[PDB]
Design the sequence.
């Protein structure tokens, strides 16, 4: 029993982190096979970041201008190219610690673990969600760029995020491992609007199911609702609309607990309209939305990895 | 910027987890050098756990009755002994992935990371605190016994916790790596009282300092207090008393933010007396107490590990 925000074990990703230095800029890179992936802004000075022309800046850089260090050993760079907002440095040695992996572009509302790193070295691991407005609420300081987010399925690491920017609002933006930003953000130090940060309704419902499984039941009510009725409430509270796809994803949790999805929706509706009257659910005094239905099933059944 | 409950990278501990089977009971063990540590209840059936005589039960077990499996390879057990509530299985091979390590018995209110494992395989990592009543609020299912908690200092893993029991209240109890339980608990399936779970005041104050550092300032008030005045309030709300030792530990955070410790105490006092009026601090609608002052400094400055 118990329910905790839980990250994937980070060991397979630890063995992939390196330090990349170009000129006087140092950040983190991801070493898989004979390629090192890192944010293209590694080629920028603080001044360049105000209005960079990455193509023109990269024209000045040769292979030998990119220092790549893994632990205390130097990798030889034999090729470089820019793909969207990431650089790919071809090195002469395949990472012997490369796990089985793939690159995935995740959907808003999905979750993933972040291994925060500085100077190529791991600092910590935490769980977070791609917000509906395509930001993440992370914990990143200067030098953390190139940190990656990932999910693990048994022995295979799906990399989904590389950290690039902190918006002036303090939230974070970054790319997939092909270098395409999530959301409308650019790798330039300019004001950028994220947009309304809505709550991930299907995740809140999964977490309520998790609460029931663990004995937190007080919020169950005698009401039901309909999808359209519930969604009228959701709109008012800046919750994402719930679709039948979402209902389908919640099916197994509905089955396990015997609580129809729409009954749980009606319990969520009363929570949105009446608040939590100073009570808590799974140790939280607000509705948590950074657990997916799959996260709940995983944690509640003890799925392991290599 | 940003502030997240963050665990240590788990890779050094992943390489130490093995599966231990005795008869029909399987749980996790920790393989360091040529010794495997695991809960002594591995020798018990579900029936034995009602009223075990561990000495008498262990007398029946020989080295060859303990199956130890690391990945898909079997370790040869050449000796066994019981130390308090842990078994130590001497094996014929030193773990080649053994990190630098020590065993530490932590104080109530300290934090540590837990690598939850099943059948010797890692499932996830999360951060938690040794409560003042010597329980932890973890996420553990059947088979998770032998999971360990740890801290990391650069390249050295300090193991501080091994999981043994879930109390009927749903909270968790376990031992240090010498096998001595934290708190009054025993490894028997009987009712056991934890006692009043108080809030870790010094950790709440560190977290308030973390909030200020990140721009969450609304809770700062115009008041100050004294240690005795504050502690009268703390007693009323089941907060641990604050000592001058705690004030000293908060000194660097006081210095960084320019907020005297007792001024922050007065802000906490008003929060306890008036609640949070539906506001949040660092994304939480209650006062968080599972960050130590050292955790705040670490995260706010980006300390890394090998």
Sequence:
């Amino acid at each position: 029993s118990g329910f905790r925000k839980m990250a994937f074990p980070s060991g397979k990703v630890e063995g992939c982190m390196v330090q990349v230095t170009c000129g006087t800029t140092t950040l983190n890179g991801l070493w898989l096979d004979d390629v090192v992936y890192c944010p293209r802004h590694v080629i920028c000075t603080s001044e360049d970041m105000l209005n960079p022309n990455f193509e023109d800046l990269l024209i000045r850089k040769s292979n030998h201008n990119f220092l790549v260090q893994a632990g205390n050993v130097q990798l030889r760079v034999i090729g470089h190219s820019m793909q969207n907002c990431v650089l790919k440095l071809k090195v002469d040695t395949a990472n012997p610690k490369t796990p089985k992996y793939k690159f995935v572009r995740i959907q808003p509302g999905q979750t993933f673990s972040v291994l925060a790193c500085y100077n190529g070295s791991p600092s910590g691991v935490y769980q977070c969600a791609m917000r509906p407005n395509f930001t993440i609420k992370g914990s990143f300081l200067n030098g953390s760029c190139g940190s990656v987010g990932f999910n693990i399925d048994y022995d295979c690491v799906s990399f989904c995020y590389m950290h690039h920017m902190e918006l002036p609002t303090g939230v974070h933006a970054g790319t997939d491992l092909e270098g395409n930003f999530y959301g409308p953000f650019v790798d330039r130090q300019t004001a950028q609007a994220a947009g309304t940060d809505t709550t991930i309704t299907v995740n809140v419902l999964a977490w309520l199911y998790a609460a029931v499984i663990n004995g937190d039941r007080w919020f169950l009510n005698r009401f039901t609702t309909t999808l359209n009725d519930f969604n009228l409430v959701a709109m008012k509270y800046n919750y994402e609309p719930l679709t039948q796809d979402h209902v389908d994803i919640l099916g197994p949790l509905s089955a396990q607990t015997g609580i129809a999805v729409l009954d749980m929706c009606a319990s969520l509706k009363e929570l949105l309209q009446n608040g939590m009257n100073g009570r808590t659910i799974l140790g939280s005094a607000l509705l948590e939305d950074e657990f997916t239905p799959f996260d709940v099933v995983r944690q509640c059944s003890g799925v392991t990895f290599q």
Notes: Residues 201-301 of chain A form a domain with the main proteinase (3clpro) structure, domain 3 fold (CATH 1.10.1840.10). The first helix of chain A runs from residue 11 to 14. Helices of chain A lie at 11-14, 54-59, 201-213, 227-236, 244-249, 251-257, 261-274, 293-301.
